[PDB]
Amino acid sequence: TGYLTIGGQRYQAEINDLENLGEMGSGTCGQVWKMRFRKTGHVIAVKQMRRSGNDLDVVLKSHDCPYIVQCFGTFITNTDVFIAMELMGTCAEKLKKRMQGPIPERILGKMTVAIVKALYYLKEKHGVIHRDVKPSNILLDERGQIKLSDFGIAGCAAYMAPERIDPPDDIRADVWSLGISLVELATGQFPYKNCVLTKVLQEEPPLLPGHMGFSGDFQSFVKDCLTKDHRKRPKYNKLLEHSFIKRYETLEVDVASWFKDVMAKTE
């Protein structure tokens, strides 16, 4: 906030001080740059957004978690807002479009661990509900790391839990989005008939195809997350003891390589 913290020290800095190194089209949205903070020598990402009508400052107290993309600070001009954050590879969304094929169970397994531990961290440590868990906001990288990108507070965002129609008043709606995301990448196809998308509350939850060769535990984990009564749908605490997790918690999986390998294409 006119101030940038990296390597565990807080510096005054100014957005215009940074070395722009050219853009990227594929972050949390497509308005993001790659730059360098001259003062420490670090190379970062800088999301740039036009200012609107109108403050969730406390994104930086989350340095603790290795599954949440570090935010270094923020800047304002009379026209835009710049949020500065650690540099990453790409959405899962991109990976899907790019491969036009499914993501392997075992990558999803690591992903799944990482996304849950992230959400847990937020609920516990910061009383947060991410409320926007989808493949666009899950970032992977060259070294094999997988992280949640916390976006703060017609197939356009049909990851909504079916528990959003009984007012008047959040805990585990995030869990449902998780499941949808898993189904989507695991199969490489957003499950639902195109329009809009009201089969959500109609149908039996869109579980994982019986014989694409997924493990039973994966299948289980996905069913559990995809429970129509939020009442019955599991908390993170429980998910984290689900064996799928317990497994990918421990199993060696070369995400680093896979990821690199999947970057043998244009785009």
Swiss-Prot record:
The keyword Phosphoprotein applies. It comes from the Eukaryota. Ubiquitous; with highest level of expression in skeletal muscle. Isoform 3 is found at low levels in placenta, fetal liver, and skeletal muscle. GO terms for cellular component: cytoplasm; cytosol; nucleus. One of its GO terms (molecular function) is ATP binding. ATP binds at M24, G25, S26, G27, T28, C29, G30, Q31, V32, K47. Its EC number is 2.7.12.2. Residues 242-265 are annotated as: DVD domain. Dual specificity protein kinase which acts as an essential component of the MAP kinase signal transduction pathway. Essential component of the stress-activated protein kinase/c-Jun N-terminal kinase (SAP/JNK) signaling pathway. With MAP2K4/MKK4, is the one of the only known kinase to directly activate the stress-activated protein kinase/c-Jun N-terminal kinases MAPK8/JNK1, MAPK9/JNK2 and MAPK10/JNK3. MAP2K4/MKK4 and MAP2K7/MKK7 both activate the JNKs by phosphorylation, but they differ in their preference for the phosphorylation site in the Thr-Pro-Tyr motif. This is Dual specificity mitogen-activated protein kinase kinase 7. The gene is MAP2K7.
